[PDB]
């Protein structure tokens, strides 16, 4: 009972976050975008990131109505790949916006930020994989696939 | 009970989700659209997306007050319905607005984008089919489904009323 | 309980959510307007719109403190009205908005906006009677007036 | 029980709901003013309006902690009352507003708003009177209610401490 | 057992409300700086108002992983203390902004604005001294400290 | 049942909370950055900002889904401390922006500003210190609680699995 309804509570906290957090990053970046005015980077951005959280938040207009498991599984991860995909586009997002404010004004620090990104993107990119990895195949290879992963990673720490 | 209390609590928060998306969009929308200031779509585009949001919202008006259970779904359904075109005209005005945006600027990066939308617009014209689909069909059984609510409204009064004496 | 305990989060939940639309529309409509500087029209919505939102928000200050039944209906309606009234506002001032970026730039397109909104008013329209009869009237007129205009339509659906 | 669990539940929508409008209106409002960068009216209208709403987030502040009957309702409709004039502000800031974007522009437009704005103007300043009204009267009652409840707290820290040896 | 439900249920809307609240005045106020481009005041305003309201948004990061009375008394005491610093910095923000949208265009309006602000001050300044003096001192003497500057008033209210 | 009750709403007042904020703080800077359109300090400033937010709203993506204990507090840490440095960059951003401001137009303001941060920033550099210090530790301790939590995992399927026949 308490499981069930510790679920349920979940979805529900999901659905609210998800909704307000994808409707406000899509406007505020519609509103980045008109305030301004590789380019080809950019519009392919914006226009990626507002249709990767509409999606998102579709997602959420059919969970409510909605064995039962598997099914919700692969709703839940589509749902968490299409937000996953929205928040590293906005930072794509804001990457090419220091990239077009600072154009024709200071090359070295646009080139700065866009490579202080990298870390991130990686840590963004490595999760990005595994939504996706979990959305093509069924739960038991993706759950040993990631004992590997992490096991391979505890003969790292020891060494040093 | 569990169930009951699920399905409350589902539109409960598929009210408050609804409200802020609807509400923050559009805004949003209006804003953006002021900010720059073909064209026909630009406009035609902006104002159904407010339109088509403050639809979704009078239904959060009018959901809170409400045989029952397939008025209860098909207004559920004019909800999801008028949110999912929301969703898409967002993504064509944002589309329109790299269009307007790049238009003596760059051809190529704006028609770049407005195509990469493709393959996303067709699950939300997808979608868009089955609710329209539901709605077209049970415009007969709804009818009369309102109308049998409101009568055993307009009976439960005259009960109510003939003991009072 | 669950029938009292229901319509309680009911009102709980509009009340948030009168509260967050009402005070959105109403702040992002105020910057639309200061953005862009026929006009009486312009003018005399933008101050209808905020006026109708916050005579709203005001009836979420009131109904927290409050036979009953009848009273709450009537403010109830009250709220719903002046919601209502604040939708189709924010509606008219969009299209008032295109007209207005457009007047001296493409008229074809304002006048074709302005246009694709009437078949929504209508329904818009419609409602806002449904709720303006219910506030002068009592439950049982409008009752039977909506059982009236329903059962008019059964006889249409069928004939095609 | 079930009262006492709607009261408490009736003041946390509220603190909720008072938080996110005050704070939104606002906003909205400084960047309105900064954005167009009788004008007299113009800056006591923000000032004020941006001055009484933060006055109402404070009393979200202070409801939270908290004979406690009185002083809890006087607390209510200073909150309530600091939210109303806010209110009225905001829709007095929007009059000025267009006042001020139509000012060389069309005069008949603005006044012609400013004026539609006095019946609804008038059921404003008709409840923004009796929380007035409240308050005033009760600057006596409630002051010792505070005391007595305050002093209730002297004394229970006073038994409190009476059984610690 | 509802007295310790209700108080949790109040750290909950307070943690939900501090953070929108203080999120969106700080975003609402550096926005109000950019668009604009005693300014001495200007600069360490704005900066002053937005370090404080982060302090209170990171104490509601820390008060979710916490005798332990005396702790969360002193911790709730520095989010109030915070907070309240917030909303007054956000007043004299809109205060210093009267004063510079205003400043070579009309003097009388910026000085009249920033001093109907006095009297709300006064009440505001009132309060942060009670919070600054309950984070140094003891619940005790402020809570008697509270009871002497009452009962002062006590005797005003007879006389008239 | 109510230590557990209470940890659960607890991670979801924080979960609603930390997205609603990051989410907010992100999209307004960026909003602040392109309407002014040491610079190099600008730049690597907001893309952090935005960088670091964006991580927490992910790890609000991931704590949804979830011995155990050890693991979820990691995740807890990460999710605090991405936040915190949030908070941090946003009062660095709102300095160089009072810097990139008042540049060409007062020093002494600008200056002033980023001097009166120093005493507030070193309790934030104090937290961010401590948050950062238990991950470094237990990189070690958490990696292998999740390899038990996911073998656990793969142990509850085959159990489940051995009872189909
Ligand atoms: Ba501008
Ligand atoms: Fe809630
Ligand atoms: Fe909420
Ligand atoms: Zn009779
Ligand atoms: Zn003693
Ligand atoms: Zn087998």
Known sequence: ?????????????????SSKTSALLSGFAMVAMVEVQMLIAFAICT???????????MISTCILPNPHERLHWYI?????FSTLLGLILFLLEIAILCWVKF?????RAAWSAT??????????????????????????????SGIRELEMLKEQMEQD
Do not use: C, G, N
């Open 1 to 17: 009972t308490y499981l069930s309804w510790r679920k349920l509570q979940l979805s529900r906290a999901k659905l609210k976050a």
């Open 76 to 80: 839940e991860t589509a749902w968490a």
């Open 47 to 57: 226009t990626l990131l507002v249709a990767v959280h509409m999606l998102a938040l």
């Open 103 to 107: 154009y024709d004004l200071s090359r």
């Open 115 to 144: 490579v202080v990104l990298i870390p991130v993107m990686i840590i963004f990119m490595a999760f990005a994989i595994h939504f996706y990895r979990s959305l093509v195949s069924h739960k038991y290879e993706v759950t040993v």
